[PDB]
Amino acid sequence: MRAPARLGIPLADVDTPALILDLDAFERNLQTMADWAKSKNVRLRPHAKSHKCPAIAHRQMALGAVGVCCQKVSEAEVMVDAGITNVLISNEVVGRTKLEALAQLALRARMGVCVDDIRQIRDLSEAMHAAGATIDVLVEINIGGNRCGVEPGDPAVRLGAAVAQADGLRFAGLQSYDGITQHVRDPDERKARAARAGDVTAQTIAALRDIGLECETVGGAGTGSFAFDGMSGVWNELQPGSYAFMDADYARNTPVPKFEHAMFVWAIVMSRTSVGQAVVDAGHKVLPIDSGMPVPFDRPGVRYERPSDEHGCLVAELDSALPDLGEKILIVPSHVDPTANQHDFFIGVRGMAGTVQEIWPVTARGCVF
Amino acid sequence: APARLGIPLADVDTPALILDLDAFERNLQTMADWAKSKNVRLRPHAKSHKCPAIAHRQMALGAVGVCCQKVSEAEVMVDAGITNVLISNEVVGRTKLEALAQLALRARMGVCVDDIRQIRDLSEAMHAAGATIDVLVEINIGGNRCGVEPGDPAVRLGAAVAQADGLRFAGLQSYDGITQHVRDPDERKARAARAGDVTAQTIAALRDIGLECETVGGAGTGSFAFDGMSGVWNELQPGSYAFMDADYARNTPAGGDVPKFEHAMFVWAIVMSRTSVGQAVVDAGHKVLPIDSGMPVPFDRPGVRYERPSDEHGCLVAELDSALPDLGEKILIVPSHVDPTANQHDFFIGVRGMAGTVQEIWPVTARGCVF
């Protein structure tokens, strides 16, 4: 898979569409976050689902992250293979081969996984037993996401018991994350919903303490809740992922530290037929639209709309705001995570307040198993 | 790759991209037979699968070539030996045109233009490499994306192509993506007839300056029967027809003169959380089932919907718990949209006897080809 850049060339010669990382903004975002974590004596475990890029995992580990999160065994394999020593699979795993593969991972790095069912505890036990390996296990409670996780309270307690009492499974604490909280616009709404999850998570921590189980890790938090979760004295290992790059969806939140746009799709105008519209070579195959529309970076009046597989329409009231034929433009993605998954490389660029100084493979793209 | 030849579907890893080889072959045969029956050429779109193996079966049933949206897609199809390839799109950027020039030397290539500048730069690149390319002039018929206005502006670009070196004027690209998912079939055919008329006027006004259209390219899975029988289009470009998705399943079907296609493409997913009653969570989220076109639909399993996807999770919901599959059971999901779905997987898992065991594993070799 050939990259659309070489070290040293300016931005203007990077082929399109590419995934651009403003290395200056990116490193300030990483620094901003790592400092704030330490300043509240909570651990940092950045989500690698955001970027699927070992280079960036390494950059996060250099600023004192305890490890990274992954969603799937194959992501964790890739991160381990690149010398990431501490990986939490912030998710449940079900399937004979996935668990067998997960054991083999436990032998070669400090692995974590989550469980929300006794059935998973059982199957995770035997697999680590057969391979003679041990894995830290979180119990995942459903605090409002209504995705995975057992009801908070007694149901989490019993699973916590089953994890301590089962072979190869060291009970390591709770996973407690609500995707819905992360993008609540008003920050009193966002704090209040975070505070309520905190109370529910505190009750489960307390009910486990009553049967002689401490929580080494109270895991969770996203880019929208980490500040309240970090401050609650309930969570101690924050898992934000979007914070390093930012997207248009997070831009809509009202704000605790602030993050800079550091991830962009770089697109050429390839049709300019009428006034009031320019079409770029970046459509929803490189700018997924699960979270509304991407936004042209620092170019007011100009919106991106009506994308196809391989086209985006730039539209504005003022003809010269839109780029002409042959001109390239930076586009803010609508959602960091699915956008990283649509590119084989991050093109790291310095000077953008620009020249290519890094080419990092998105090695984890395709690790869905 | 999540499978091996000989294993049953049950043992395939999740989430996987399953091709029902039986329904797929029926879809290819139906479309191939129909284009022959209406005396039009078929140039199936490869943007839909990015899978050279599928392109070969299309060529094998008498396709004149394939369509690609990007030069790097075209490059992949040529290296696998599909040697007649139209870029149903404009191309801008010296680097892309130089690579296109090098493709032209080794295959019957085509590209579209809507601007004198693309004509300028494409001639120069084709000249420099000593190659030739067939060029379609693209007209906006309702898409409101690329292409110039019908009639005179097309005529002008036609004239420029003839004049320019390495550029053979090959005719018109006339396609509207909105037309394909107009739900009412009478509404759909009327939209395609209005596009027929304005495309016919552009053909006649090009005839008045000594320019014939060898190709009148266009049509999708929604419009190909109307466009094909119009006597205006002669090279249909459907792509989704071989696979099918939930978006096309929502189209109210037209009469017996328009052929039907079966679901042949699915996402194979395991329930990896079954915590509550009336919900099961699978390991196929929107990173393997894109939702640009709306919600994927669990295959032939009524009362069960797929909703509220994250990255790596989908929620199956039912009002009757027993209808849902249980923890560790695997399920087939029809994608909402063929094209971006294919782009989220590295392999098609061909599976025979689903009406099943694995017989083919076809790499999605054009994934990544965006340049």
Strand-pair category, B41-42 with B235-236? parallel
Task: Check: CB of residue A58 under 8 Å from CB of residue A78.
Answer: no
Alpha carbon distances (Å) from B58 to A5, A211, B95, B354: 35, 65, 30, 22
Mutant choice from A273, A293, A347 vs B, greatest count of B C-beta within 10 A: A273
Task: Check: CB of residue B311 under 8 Å from CB of residue B285.
Answer: yes
Let me know if residue A368 belongs to a domain.
Answer: no
> Are residues B157 and B46 part of one domain?
yes
Distance from CA of A328 to the nearest CA of B (A): 10
By C-alpha distance, the chain A residue nearest B1 is A369
Across the interface, whether the CB atoms of A94 and B273 are under 8 A apart is answered yes
CATH code where residue A305 lies: 2.40.37.20
| Burial of A14 from C-beta contacts in 10 A (0-12 / 13-18 / 19+) | buried
Per the structure, the count of domains in chain B is 2
Residue B133 to residue B117: CA distance in whole angstroms: 16
Residue A212 to residue A75: CA distance in whole angstroms: 34
> Are residues A206 and A60 part of one domain?
yes
By C-alpha distance, the chain B residue nearest A92 is B272
> Are residues A151 and A266 part of one domain?
no
Question: Which of A284, A310, A366 is nearest residue B69 as measured by Cβ atoms?
Answer: A310
- By residue count, chain A amounts to 369
> Are residues B223 and B95 part of one domain?
yes
Q: Of B193, B213, B195, whose CA–CA distance to B203 is shortest?
A: B213
Residue A267 to residue A329: CA distance in whole angstroms: 6
> Are residues A290 and A233 part of one domain?
no
Residue B16 to residue A363: CA distance in whole angstroms: 19
Let me know if residue B96 belongs to a domain.
Answer: yes
Q: Which domain holds residue B301?
A: 9-16+261-363
Task: Check: CB of residue A102 under 8 Å from CB of residue A123.
Answer: no
- Which residues in chain A have their CB less than 8 angstroms from residue B346's CB? 366
Question: Which of B115, B290, B339 is nearest residue A288 as measured by Cβ atoms?
Answer: B290
Distance from CA of A322 to the nearest CA of B (A): 15
- Which residues in chain B have their CB less than 8 angstroms from residue A116's CB? 273, 275
Across the interface, whether the CB atoms of A326 and B92 are under 8 A apart is answered yes
Residue B370 to residue A64: CA distance in whole angstroms: 36
Let me know if residue A4 belongs to a domain.
Answer: no
> Are residues B196 and B59 part of one domain?
yes
Across the interface, whether the CB atoms of B13 and A95 are under 8 A apart is answered yes
Alpha carbon distances (Å) from B43 to A122, B82, B319: 53, 12, 44
Q: Where are the alpha helices (DSSP H) in chain A?
A: 23-39, 54-62, 73-81, 96-106, 118-130, 154-165, 187-209, 226-231, 248-251, 336-340
CATH code where residue B53 lies: 3.20.20.10
Q: CB B190: neighbour CB atoms within 10 A?
A: 14
| Burial of B307 from C-beta contacts in 10 A (0-12 / 13-18 / 19+) | exposed
Question: Residue B202: what are its φ and ψ, rounded to 5°?
Answer: -75, -35
Let me know if residue A252 belongs to a domain.
Answer: no
Residue B326 to residue A116: CA distance in whole angstroms: 14
- Which residues in chain B have their CB less than 8 angstroms from residue A16's CB? 93, 371
Across the interface, whether the CB atoms of A147 and B311 are under 8 A apart is answered no
Q: Of B218, B260, B245, B233, whose CA–CA distance to B30 is shortest?
A: B260
Q: Where are the alpha helices (DSSP H) in chain B?
A: 21-37, 52-60, 71-79, 94-104, 116-129, 152-163, 177-180, 185-207, 224-229, 246-249, 338-342
Across the interface, whether the CB atoms of A94 and B271 are under 8 A apart is answered yes
Across the interface, whether the CB atoms of A284 and B291 are under 8 A apart is answered no
> Are residues B108 and B208 part of one domain?
yes
| Burial of A179 from C-beta contacts in 10 A (0-12 / 13-18 / 19+) | middle
- Which residues in chain A have their CB less than 8 angstroms from residue B279's CB? 146
Q: Of B30, B4, B7, whose CA–CA distance to B259 is shortest?
A: B30
Residue B44 to residue B64: CA distance in whole angstroms: 9
DSSP string across B84-111:
EEEE-S---SHHHHHHHHHHHTTSEEEE
Let me know if residue A340 belongs to a domain.
Answer: yes
Distance from CA of A312 to the nearest CA of B (A): 8
Distance from CA of A113 to the nearest CA of B (A): 13
By C-alpha distance, the chain B residue nearest A269 is B92
A51, two tokens: 């970027």
Task: Check: CB of residue B18 under 8 Å from CB of residue B7.
Answer: no
Q: Of B86, B79, B47, whose CA–CA distance to B63 is shortest?
A: B86
> Are residues A62 and A95 part of one domain?
yes
**Radius of gyration (C-alpha) of chain B in whole angstroms:** 22
Mutant choice from A141, A268, A270, A329 vs B, greatest count of B C-beta within 10 A: A270
Method: X-ray
- Which residues in chain A have their CB less than 8 angstroms from residue B268's CB? none
Let me know if residue B369 belongs to a domain.
Answer: no
First-to-last alpha carbon distance for chain A, in angstroms, is 21
Residue B226 to residue B141: CA distance in whole angstroms: 15
- Which residues in chain A have their CB less than 8 angstroms from residue B272's CB? 91-95, 148
Residue B86 to residue B186: CA distance in whole angstroms: 31
Task: Check: CB of residue A339 under 8 Å from CB of residue A288.
Answer: yes
Is A277 strand, coil or helix? strand
For tokens 């892309």, what's the residue?
B96
> Are residues B268 and B183 part of one domain?
no
Let me know if residue B224 belongs to a domain.
Answer: yes
Question: Which of A148, A272, A306 is nearest residue B281 as measured by Cβ atoms?
Answer: A148
> Are residues A35 and A148 part of one domain?
yes
Question: Which of B144, B177, B292 is nearest residue A289 as measured by Cβ atoms?
Answer: B292
First-to-last alpha carbon distance for chain B, in angstroms, is 25
Last residue of a domain, one of A210, A244, A278: A244
Distance from CA of B207 to the nearest CA of A (A): 23
> Are residues B225 and B164 part of one domain?
yes
Question: Which of A1, A116, A268 is nearest residue B273 as measured by Cβ atoms?
Answer: A116
- Which residues in chain B have their CB less than 8 angstroms from residue A337's CB? 287, 311
Please report, as a single letter, which amino acid is at residue B261: F
B132, two tokens: 């030739």
Last residue of a domain, one of A211, A244, A277: A244
Residue B49 to residue B38: CA distance in whole angstroms: 25
Angle ∠(B85,A306,B49) on CA atoms, nearest 5: 35
Let me know if residue B251 belongs to a domain.
Answer: no
Last residue of a domain, one of A197, A219, A244: A244
> Are residues B159 and B272 part of one domain?
no
